[PDB]
Structures are given as structure tokens and as C-alpha cells.
Amino acid sequence: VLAGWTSLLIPPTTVLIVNLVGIVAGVSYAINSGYQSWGPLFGKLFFAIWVIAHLYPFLKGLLGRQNRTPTIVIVWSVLLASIFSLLWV
Amino acid sequence: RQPMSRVVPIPSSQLTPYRVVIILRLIILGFFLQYRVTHPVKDAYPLWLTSVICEIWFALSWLLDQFPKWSPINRETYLERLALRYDREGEPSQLDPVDVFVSTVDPLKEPPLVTANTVLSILSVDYPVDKVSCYVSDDGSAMLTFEALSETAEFAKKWVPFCKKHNIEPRAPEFYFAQKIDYLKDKIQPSFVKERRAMKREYEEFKVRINALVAKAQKMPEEGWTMQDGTAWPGNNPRDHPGMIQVFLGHSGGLDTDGNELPRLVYVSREKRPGFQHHKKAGAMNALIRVSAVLTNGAYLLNVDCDHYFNNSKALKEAMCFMMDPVIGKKTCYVQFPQRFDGIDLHDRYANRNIVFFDINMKGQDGVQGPVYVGTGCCFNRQALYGYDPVLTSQKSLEKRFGQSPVFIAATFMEQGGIPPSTNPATLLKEAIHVISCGYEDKTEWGKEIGWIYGSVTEDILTGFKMHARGWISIYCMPPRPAFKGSAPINLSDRLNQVLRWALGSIEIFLSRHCPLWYGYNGKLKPLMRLAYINTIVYPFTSIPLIAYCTLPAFCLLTNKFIIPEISNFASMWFILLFVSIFTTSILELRWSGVSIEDWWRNEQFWVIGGTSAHLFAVFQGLLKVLAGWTSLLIPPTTVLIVNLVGIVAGVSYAINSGYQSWGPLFGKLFFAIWVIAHLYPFLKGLLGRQNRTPTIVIVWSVLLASIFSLLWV
Amino acid sequence: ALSETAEFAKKWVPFCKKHNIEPRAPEFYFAQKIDYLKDKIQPSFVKERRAMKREYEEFKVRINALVAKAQKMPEEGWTMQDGTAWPGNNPRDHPGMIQVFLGHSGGLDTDGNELPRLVYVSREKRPGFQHHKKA
């Protein structure tokens, strides 16, 4: 309007990878902290599993039988997730 | 002038990271051993020694297994170029003659129906009728097999023209009619609906006739079997039957419904006498080769098992695309086809497909010199089986090597095949009977340098190694549609029996001569092929470190300490690095090979259980037999399973009694010993569950052995 | 339904006796997906099975037609094929009837032999008396 494939599957891949790596690293860092704070950890554990559960058919479609995922999509998703992870720092 | 077949290297996009993770594995595995040597446990010193020994053996196994798979390749065929070059239209074909060998021993255990289906499938291959022949060899000299072959030949006159006209796939009537897939997919021919109904109604009556013969041949008449002609069956005694040769279909055998001819079918039964060893399959194969040379003298010999049928009718043409090429045909010893099985479970509980072996290891072996001979679905070059050296771009000796039949010696010289003009066809039957006699191989080189090699139950590996030692190379081809399909076992006991047979054969080869280590030092065998042969022969021997590693948990946890020290600087770094890289190479393997994760995981589970169940007994039998001239094969995994389960339960309960703030040891002993149960999970499912096949005596023996172990802990 | 079953038994029974069909019930035997050509020695079995299946399907059609035709009570009561009214028009005031379908003189099957005797028994029921049902 302002100016007169297979990439349609990438943003969920970035969200999936980012959330998975994030929660894993964060729980490990919580183990390193070893604090008596159930509230924050439980809140961040119940959350971000809701996302994976709602993206569970996505994960099954990407990895499993009857796969239809080009390698270029995986490479692009990894690159975008790398930019996001570097942006966090 | 364009190449008949093309070799396609794996793209560098997938190949380069594979080598990068391989070298990274080497660097990070040569340092884990150093870190684990510099940290001995002063309270678990023998246990620490056992763990480090197991790790050393596992690392060496991984290295010698991953070296052959460094440079895999693929092959593609162009059948259109074959049609344009040799299979021209409006002209007799120049295709070399081919002979297909089928071997059977007992019709009682192996039903004649599957053998009849295999014969029908072979007789209906997409090949010229006058350039192909079939030889069926019965080791037991069975009357039922003879009549089954006769009925199969009678039914072939109706089955073959229908398949040729309507392009029926597969050619086996049983498997074709059993398919539930829509048969009206691309059938252009109008007169196909009516013919299919009649052909099905005729196959059902053929099955009825076969069943009637099988039912009638369950007891031996006291006066012996009598043929339809009236003369008694010569093979009344399976040990004193003289050699018989019978031809069913051929030039003068008869005409089919369309008036054409059919490929020649020959029934061969060798002469057996008491007091002489016949070597079973190897002797039968040698007899078949000699008889085929005398009768038809085919250029190439394709070996097909009785339970394997042609799923693709153009397998012979694809093989000829490799063997008949002038540049890669004068140095090719055999072409190996992948083995596929049907009628199996969707999950493939018993891992009968062998995905990893047949789509990863075979390609890596083909990358250097070619795949190893594995039995069924192999097309051999006739000149290679005679011990002749490859070409790369004497009467006394001939009689000593081959035999005392001048017809076979003369037929040897025919490198392109076909009956020599000097040899009159009037006396081609008496000479064949002369060769089939049991006193032919005496004082000859058969079974030592020429043809199949004796001295092993798994006598296929030795033959391939002997052929490769002379400088020959083999070709691995993968058609889009599998060329051969067989019936896989559906029993844990049967699968373990065949694994035990293979491992025992490898051990028997290792202790005897003709090994890759002390034999083959001629300078023509590539070192990487030597490594692959060494791995295939040795991999029995890795069982003892494996069972020690799987016996570690209960013995360690019932006592104190562990194989691991406290986590500190540089301590857990190597742990995570090794674990991550171990999981890292797997995804690249699946990526380039195309193997699903479930298949690889199932192969890992089978590797563990077969490492226990069959391999220690293979080593034990070989060692004891060499130094000294059922259902127990399932016991050691049962002892390991029970010992580990009871151990971890008691140890965690004792940890509850202690109630200490030590997460490290408990977590280490909890994550471990669940790995063992997970890798033995199909074992637990097989023992306890539906379709149980566990005798009570096995359970009693396992309980007794576990009781001795538990009392030994105290 | 019993009359039609007796009519069809003259064709079903000899086939089962000759070819050792298991189970004897046509519905469950034909509904099995297991390979029926397991141990059938008899040569004239493939042709007979097709005809027997094509006859059982028509028997099922006839039974379905009878069931569909017997969903409503005619206002004048049911009438048999002979013409006489059905005695059991009222399920509570029906006098006892006994009818024999197959037997010694009932008829011969396709092979000319006989069939086991089949008897249809309906007891007499009157109002004001307990019948104890199955007992």
C-alpha cells in the first residue's frame, strides 16, 4: 500500500529456538544462583511452556516424520536467533 | 559417448561440517582421557580403572568406525542411454547373458509358496528371454520342491505375458495382489480390468494346487515317493541321492499364451554321499556356478535368496548399466543392491531394516573401494569368481585350478559368455552330471581361491574380501524403487539367532587365517578398505567393555563414590564438550544420510542389547572352541536389567535414609543407570508384555545369577 | 426370518460340511480379513466361495426387506402368505403354536441329504398369569 517462498515458516522458528535456549540458560543460571525465590522461577517456568505447547504442532512439523523443512530455512532461523541473542547482551 | 552412469559426490555444504565435527571430536576426545587419567579416585581405584578402560575401548571403536565414512558418494543411472546404446529397437539386443541363482534346503520349514513367488518374479524380469536364465538348487533333494517348480512353470505361461503387457509391479503375484493401494493409477491399457479379474481367479486356484501338494507331501510313503511317470524318485534318501538335472522351461519347453518363449529354468540337485562334507550353501553355490558354466555360461551371476523377490523389474538393466560399461566394467567384481524388508511393524521394533548400516556405512564403504558382500541381491562378474586379476587401463595349471572337465575349462575362456562353437550341444547334459558329482572338487582349488570360500558360516564376507584383495572394486547402487524385497523376522529370538550367527562367523574368521591383519598384504587393497574389513570382523569384540560399562551402576552405587570427581574448573567443561559433540555429529549424520531420528535411536537400542545378548556368547563360543578344538542367549541382559533396577532402587532408598545435601553424587547415579534401562527398554518390553516368549527356566537362571551377584556385593 | 434361514440353510450347510468352513456363521466367516486360502486342499473351493458369498448377500437383502416391511402393524393384523391371519396378533393373548421347518420330510439340501430338525415353539400366554419370562 505504501509503495503501490518457504520464508512464511521462519518467525515461529526464531521464537521457538529463542524461547528454548532462553529458558534452558536461565534455569541453569538460577541453579548457579541457588536462591530461595520460588516466585520468579515458577512464574518464568510455567510461562514459556505455554508458548512451546501452543507451538508444539510447529515443533512436530519441523522435526519428525514427513519432514518438509529446507535447510535454508534452518540457516536463516539460526542467523536471526544469533542476532537476537547478541542483542540481549 | 556420454557416460552410462554418473558418480555424484555429496555436496560440500553437508560434507565439510561433517569433517569439521569429526576433527573436533578427535581433539576433544584425546583430552578427556588425559583429564580422566590425571584425576584418579583413591576410594574407588579398581572401579576407576574399569571405567577408564571402558572409555578407552569405546573411543577406539568410534575412531575405527568413523574413519571409513570420511568421503561418501552416490551413483545415478541413465536407462535411456542403455536403450539407445545397446537395447536398440528393430535389432537383436547386445546385452550380456545373465544367470539368476536361487538356493533352497527344506520345503517343510520354508513354504514352497514364497519360493514359487520368487521364481515367478525372476522369470518375469524386464530382460530379453534368450539372454537370461534361472537356476534353482535344492540342497535337500525334495520331491515337493520339484512338483512346486513344475506347477510354477505351468502357471508362468499365463502370469508372464500379463505382466509384460500391462507393466505389473511388483512381478510377484502374491505381493502384487496383496497390496491395498489403488491398482488403477496409471493403467492406460483398455483391456486391463477384465484381465485382472481372470488372473486373480487363476492365481487363487494356483495357490489351491500348491496347498494340495504341500498337504499331500507331509508323510513319506513306505515305498518312497513315486513320480507321475511311475519311476521312483531318485532322491528318496536326502543323504544318498545321486545328482539330477531337470529343465522345465526353455526353447523347446513350451510357448506362453502369446506364443513367445520363456527364460530357461533349470532344477539342479547335487550328488551327496555319506562321509563327505558338502559345506552347505558354499558348496551349493560352487556347484551352481560350474553347472551354469557348462549349460549356459552366463556372463554375470545374480544371487537371489528364496525369500527375496524383485520389487523393480528393471534391476537387471540397472546392473548392466554398471557392469557393461567398458571403462568401469573390466575392473568391477560385483554390484551390491540394498536389502529392504516389508511386512514389518510401523515402528520397526526389531530394527530389521538396518537403516544406519544400509544407508550410512555402505555409502562410506563405497566412497573408497565399494560395499562389502552381504549375500542376497548381488550381481557377480564371472571372471572375478575364477581368481583372474583385474585388467586396468598352462593346461596342467588349468586342470589343477578348475577341475577335470574339459567343457568347463573351455567355457571359462568365454569372457563374454555363451556356448563355445566347438562344444556340441548334443552332449551338454552328461557333462553337467559329471561336474555335479561330489568327487569333482577333490584335489582342486575350489573353495580356497576360486568361487565361494569355505571356513565360515557367514561365508559372504570372506568371499568379498578375497575378491577385493586382488585389486577389484565393487559398485553400490540405490534405485529409486528397491530392487529386492524380503521378509524380515518378527521374533526377538529369531533376530538374536541370526545376529549370533553373524557374530560367531566373524569371530571364527578372526581366529583363522585370511584376516585383514595378517593376510592381504599384497599392495592392491586400499588401507581404508582394510580398516572397514577390520571393523566388520572385530565388532564382536567390543561386547566385554560394553557389559562392564553397563554393569558399573549397581556395583558402584551399592558402594560409595563414583567415576566422577567434584565439579570444578576444567572438570565439567570436558564433560559437556564431549556430550554436546556426541550429540552434534548425530544430527549431521541424519542430515546428509536422510535417516530419521527414531530409526537412529532404535538402532542404538538394538546395538546395546545385541552387544550383550549375542556378542559375549559369540566371543565365548569362539574362544572356547578355538582353545579346545538354547534360549540362554537372552540371560545376560536379564541379569544386567534386574541388577541395575534393584541396585538403583535400594541405593536411592539408602540415600533417603542418609538425607544428605549432596546433589552431585545422587544426580550422577540417577541420570546414569537410566541410560542403561532406556537402551534395554525393548528388552524389558520383550520380556514382559504381549507376545511373550520367555521360558520360566530363563527367569529362574537370571534370578539365581542376580542372587549370586547381590551376595557378592556384601 | 426362521423360514428364510431354513431356506438358505439348504445351500449353506453342504458347503460348510464339504469345505470345513470355520466358523459356521456366514456373517462372521465372511467378515474375517484373514487369508481364507490357508489350508484348503479341495480344488473346487475358489469358485464355490464366490457363489456362496453372492448368495449370502442376497439372503441379507431378503432379511432386510422383511425387517423393513415389519415395522408397522397392519390395522387388520398380520396376514401369512397362505392367507390365514397370524394367531399371535396380540403379544398377550396368543395361543400356543408349534411349527417344524426342517426335518425328515422337511426337504433335501443340494447334496440330497437331510438337515437337523428345526422347531419353532411359542407358548400360550393369557392375561392375569405370570409367565416368569426366561425360566
Numbering used by the authors:
A (entry chain B): 950 to 953, 979 to 1063
B (entry chain A): 261 to 653, 718 to 953, 979 to 1063
C (entry chain C): 408 to 542
Task: Provide passages from the article that reported this PDB entry.
Cellulose is synthesized by cellulose synthase (CesA), a membrane-integrated processive family-2 glycosyltransferase. The enzyme synthesizes cellulose from UDP-activated glucose (UDP-Glc) and translocates the polymer across the plasma membrane through a channel formed by its own membrane-spanning segment. While bacterial CesAs primarily function as monomeric enzymes, structural analyses of plant CesAs revealed their assembly into triangular-shaped trimeric complexes of three catalytically active subunits. Cryo-EM analyses of all three CesA isoforms reveal the formation of homotrimeric complexes, similar to the secondary cell wall CesAs.
The CSR has been proposed to be intrinsically disordered and only its short N- and C-terminal helical segments are visible in the cryo-EM maps. Viewed from the cytosol, the extra density resembles a hook extending by about 20 Å clockwise and tangentially along the trimer’s corners at the water-lipid interface. The helix has been modeled for GmCesA1 and GmCesA6, while its density is detectable at a similar position but too discontinuous for modeling in the GmCesA3 map. Between the different isoforms, GmCesA1 exhibits greatest product accumulation. In contrast, the activities of GmCesA1 and GmCesA6 peak at pH 8, with a slight decline at pH 9. Quantifying the release of UDP during biosynthesis reactions using a ‘UDP-Glo’ glycosyltransferase assay reveals Michaelis–Menten constants for GmCesA1 and GmCesA3 with respect to UDP-Glc of 0.44 mM and 0.18 mM, respectively. The apparent Vmax value is ~eightfold higher for GmCesA1 compared to GmCesA3. GmCesA1’s apparent IC50 for UDP is about 0.8 mM, whereas this concentration is increased to about 1.3–1.5 mM for GmCesA6 and GmCesA3, respectively.
